[PDB]
Each structure stands twice: as C-alpha cells, then as structure tokens.
Design an enzyme around this catalytic site. Sequence first.
Site, PDB file in Angstrom:
ATOM      1  N   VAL A  27       6.885  -3.205 -62.422  1.00 29.95           N
ATOM      2  CA  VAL A  27       6.462  -4.572 -62.109  1.00 29.95           C
ATOM      3  C   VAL A  27       5.100  -4.586 -61.377  1.00 29.95           C
ATOM      4  CG1 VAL A  27       6.992  -6.226 -60.320  1.00 29.95           C
ATOM      5  CG2 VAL A  27       8.565  -6.001 -62.260  1.00 29.95           C
ATOM      6  N   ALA A  31      -1.895   1.712 -54.132  1.00 33.95           N
ATOM      7  CA  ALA A  31      -2.004   2.949 -53.374  1.00 33.95           C
ATOM      8  C   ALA A  31      -0.766   3.232 -52.502  1.00 33.95           C
ATOM      9  CB  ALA A  31      -3.304   2.945 -52.477  1.00 33.95           C
ATOM     10  N   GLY A  33       2.436   2.162 -52.979  1.00 32.83           N
ATOM     11  CA  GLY A  33       3.739   2.223 -53.642  1.00 32.83           C
ATOM     12  C   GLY A  33       3.815   1.489 -54.957  1.00 32.83           C
ATOM     13  N   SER A  34       5.009   1.508 -55.534  1.00 33.59           N
ATOM     14  CA  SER A  34       5.273   0.886 -56.815  1.00 33.59           C
ATOM     15  C   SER A  34       6.575   0.135 -56.758  1.00 33.59           C
ATOM     16  CB  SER A  34       5.337   1.955 -57.902  1.00 33.59           C
ATOM     17  OG  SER A  34       4.027   2.389 -58.223  1.00 33.59           O
ATOM     18  N   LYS A  50      11.172  -1.276 -54.419  1.00 33.08           N
ATOM     19  CA  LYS A  50       9.868  -0.711 -54.015  1.00 33.08           C
ATOM     20  C   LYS A  50      10.007   0.730 -53.555  1.00 33.08           C
ATOM     21  CE  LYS A  50       6.047  -1.683 -50.725  1.00 33.08           C
ATOM     22  NZ  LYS A  50       5.591  -2.677 -49.693  1.00 33.08           N
ATOM     23  N   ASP A 165       5.372 -10.086 -48.748  1.00 34.80           N
ATOM     24  CA  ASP A 165       4.093  -9.417 -48.840  1.00 34.80           C
ATOM     25  C   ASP A 165       4.214  -8.267 -49.832  1.00 34.80           C
ATOM     26  OD1 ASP A 165       1.645  -8.075 -48.660  1.00 34.80           O
ATOM     27  OD2 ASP A 165       1.345  -8.710 -46.544  1.00 34.80           O
TER      28      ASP A 165
HETATM   29  C1  LIG Z   1       6.719 -11.369 -44.898  1.00 31.60           C
HETATM   30  C2  LIG Z   1       6.664 -10.130 -44.004  1.00 31.60           C
HETATM   31  C3  LIG Z   1       7.979 -10.091 -43.227  1.00 31.60           C
HETATM   32  C4  LIG Z   1       5.472 -10.155 -43.026  1.00 31.60           C
HETATM   33  C5  LIG Z   1       6.536  -8.866 -44.842  1.00 31.60           C
HETATM   34  C6  LIG Z   1       7.304  -8.599 -45.952  1.00 31.60           C
HETATM   35  C7  LIG Z   1       6.890  -7.360 -46.398  1.00 31.60           C
HETATM   36  N1  LIG Z   1       7.316  -6.587 -47.445  1.00 31.60           N
HETATM   37  C8  LIG Z   1       7.683  -7.050 -48.643  1.00 31.60           C
HETATM   38  O1  LIG Z   1       7.697  -8.262 -48.897  1.00 31.60           O
HETATM   39  N2  LIG Z   1       8.073  -6.083 -49.528  1.00 31.60           N
HETATM   40  C9  LIG Z   1       8.389  -6.262 -50.848  1.00 31.60           C
HETATM   41  C10 LIG Z   1       7.747  -7.187 -51.690  1.00 31.60           C
HETATM   42  C11 LIG Z   1       8.105  -7.307 -53.042  1.00 31.60           C
HETATM   43  C12 LIG Z   1       9.125  -6.531 -53.583  1.00 31.60           C
HETATM   44  C13 LIG Z   1       9.763  -5.618 -52.765  1.00 31.60           C
HETATM   45 CL1  LIG Z   1      11.080  -4.547 -53.373  1.00 31.60          CL
HETATM   46  C14 LIG Z   1       9.395  -5.481 -51.429  1.00 31.60           C
HETATM   47 CL2  LIG Z   1      10.292  -4.297 -50.430  1.00 31.60          CL
HETATM   48  N3  LIG Z   1       5.937  -6.930 -45.546  1.00 31.60           N
HETATM   49  C15 LIG Z   1       5.220  -5.779 -45.558  1.00 31.60           C
HETATM   50  C16 LIG Z   1       4.685  -5.193 -46.696  1.00 31.60           C
HETATM   51  C17 LIG Z   1       3.954  -4.008 -46.691  1.00 31.60           C
HETATM   52  C18 LIG Z   1       3.707  -3.365 -45.497  1.00 31.60           C
HETATM   53  C19 LIG Z   1       4.205  -3.918 -44.330  1.00 31.60           C
HETATM   54  C20 LIG Z   1       3.920  -3.239 -43.020  1.00 31.60           C
HETATM   55  C21 LIG Z   1       2.500  -3.524 -42.539  1.00 31.60           C
HETATM   56  N4  LIG Z   1       2.091  -4.792 -42.544  1.00 31.60           N
HETATM   57  O2  LIG Z   1       1.801  -2.612 -42.143  1.00 31.60           O
HETATM   58  C22 LIG Z   1       4.930  -5.099 -44.370  1.00 31.60           C
HETATM   59  N5  LIG Z   1       5.687  -7.885 -44.543  1.00 31.60           N
END
Ligand SMILES: CC(C)(C)c1c/c(=N\C(=O)Nc2cccc(Cl)c2Cl)n(-c2cccc(CC(N)=O)c2)[nH]1
EC number: 2.7.11.24
Length: 349
Positions: A27, A31, A33-34, A50, A165
């Site tokens: 999807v 850099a 992740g996937s 992810k 995010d």
């Molecule tokens: C909204 C909020 C709480 C601030 C958030 C969600 C999130 N991660 C995701 O939303 N991950 C995600 C997105 C789409 C699909 C999948 Cl499986 C995942 Cl785990 N975040 C997030 C994403 C990447 C890195 C970091 C850590 C950093 N900022 O250094 C946080 N942050």
Amino acid sequence: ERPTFYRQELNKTIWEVPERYQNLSPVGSGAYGSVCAAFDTKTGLRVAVKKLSRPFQSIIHAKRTYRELRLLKHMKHENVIGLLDVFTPARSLEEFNDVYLVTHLMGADLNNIVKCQKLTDDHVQFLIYQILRGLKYIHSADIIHRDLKPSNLAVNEDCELKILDFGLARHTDDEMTGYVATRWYRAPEIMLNWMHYNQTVDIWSVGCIMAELLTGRTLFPGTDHIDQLKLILRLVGTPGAELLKKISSESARNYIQSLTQMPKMNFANVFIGANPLAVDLLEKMLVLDSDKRITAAQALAHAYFAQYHDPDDEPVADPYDQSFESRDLLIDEWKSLTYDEVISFVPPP
Ligand SMILES: CC(C)(C)c1c/c(=N\C(=O)Nc2cccc(Cl)c2Cl)n(-c2cccc(CC(N)=O)c2)[nH]1
C-alpha cells in the site's frame, strides 16, 4: 500462545506475520517503513500493517520506533488512529529486530474526497468537526501532530474521519522544497522556523484543510517557502510589532520586516458564497500570531458546528507520560523499552 508466523517477500521486503493476517498487498513505502493492506481472519477486519524499516539502526530510528509505539498504544478515540495489534517474530529481546504495527485499514483520504466529491457545507461541518474532536483529544495529551494534511486524514464512505500519520518519509529539506503539498499546510512559524512552536501549529493546518474543502482548491499552494509566505501574508496581513518581537529568529524577523506592509483581506470576498460562520471560523484559525488562534476545544463550541457539538461526547486523553522525549539512551536501551511495550500490548476488546 505465540502465534505461528509465515514468511513472504513483497517488493524486496520480507514480511513475517501471524497466520491470522492474510492477503497482504503493498500500500505504501518510504525510508522509515512499508505498509500492506491485509485481512485479519481473527476479527474480520481489513487492516493496515506497517513494517518499520530497520527500526533500531540508529538512536533516532530506535527512539522514533519507541515514540510511534507509545503514541499508538495511547490513542483511544473515534477520530484518531488506534492500535489493533503490534507484533514481532522475535522470541526474545536478543532476537528482536523488527516491529510490525496493525491498524484499521482506510483507503480513502481527504484528497480523494475533495477532488472527487462535491462536498456540501454540511459535509464540511462534519469533516472539520471530527478533525477538531480528534485534535482536542490529541492536544489534551500534550501531543502535537505537526503534519496535518489531507493525506493524513482517513475518511470512510459514511464520511467518518480519523487522524493518522502515514509518514514513511523524512521531511528532508528537499522534501519541503518547491511546489509541494508537504509544505502547503504548515504554520508559518514552523515553515520558517520563527520561534519555538507549540500545538497551535495544528490549528493553522486545519484552517488550510477547511478552506480547501470549501473551495476545492489549495489555500496556500506556494511554489517555494517565500512564495508561500507571500500568499499567506497577502490573506492574513503582514505581522504587527507584537508578533515580530515573538519571532526569536533574528534572520527570519529581519526578512519579514523587509516586506511592504499589507492588511488582512476580507475573507467573505475570498471565500465567496461560504456560510458566514465558516468564514468567521477561518478568520479565527488563520491568525498569524499562534498565541491568538482558536483552540480545538474552543472551536468545537463555535456556532458553525451547532449541528454536531456535544460537550458530553468530546472526550480528552488519559495522561501521556512523554518524559522519554528529553531522555538520552543507547540504541539497545530504546530497543528494550520498545520490546517491553510490544510484550505488554493488550488488544482492544
Ligand atoms: C496521529 C499521531 C498519534 C500523532 C500519529 C499516528 C502515527 N502513526 C500512524 O498513524 N501509523 C500508521 C499509519 C497508517 C497505517 C499504519 Cl499500519 C500505521 Cl501503524 N504517528 C506516527 C507516525 C510515524 C512516526 C511517529 C513517531 C514520530 N513522530 O517520530 C508517529 N503519529
């Protein structure tokens, strides 16, 4: 008790996941992740999985990995992405090198909406209401999103919305350069590094998103940082002396004072035909001085959302301990902290 894992290769990446997750398809990649879509046979849910790319390769990566797991484990709110599962194929700390995160799948983001659909003011109310409801929660935990934009807002067929995010990229200088959506939603204080910023950056982004829902057009589609600043200052006016003294970057301050002074424009003549209450709310979000912007909690009580606002169902977060943010640890210490959090995860009931 440990599930059985199976292996497959997807676009040059090995994925080793529990048998419960089936029909993995790529999807997105970057850099850091996937992500794959999959079907979770245990819950009957379509999920996103992810896989972090070498999460413990460096101190910045290890801490970022820890940070994302901490955040996702905490987020328990209808309008914010939550953690369905987290797993590793490692049977011990010693083997532990990969981290996988599982959430609800969304396909459609707000770009899909704004460019395809004809949103009524009712749709705009409902969508911005849910962003603000989510943001109140996030901000209540002293979390700053910092990268709110249409591609980080998942929206389903019923116009239900979740903040996430999807950042798999380093927002490098190159990535923020030129005619790019990566920069169009940024508060000017963080775009230009004016001062130490705070959660109010996120309200600027919401104003940009709301404008674009109303008009179908990007609000500040700058061709570069300076062109974007000029677009901004044309609409909201050049800074007064009170804001200029708050610009602690002397070079940035000196530059913005080179510009010919401009008044704030009439937003009713910019957002032609918009609900006057939408116009009023935009005026209160898109204030240059971030001290003077409306907050998410204040915005929820604005008359524009009268149809949706329920002060008994706009919940705040449990306390979120981010004392780790100011802590310096070795990679293996961030790693063991992360492993503990993987091990302690309890799924949503
Ligand atoms: C909204 C909020 C709480 C601030 C958030 C969600 C999130 N991660 C995701 O939303 N991950 C995600 C997105 C789409 C699909 C999948 Cl499986 C995942 Cl785990 N975040 C997030 C994403 C990447 C890195 C970091 C850590 C950093 N900022 O250094 C946080 N942050």
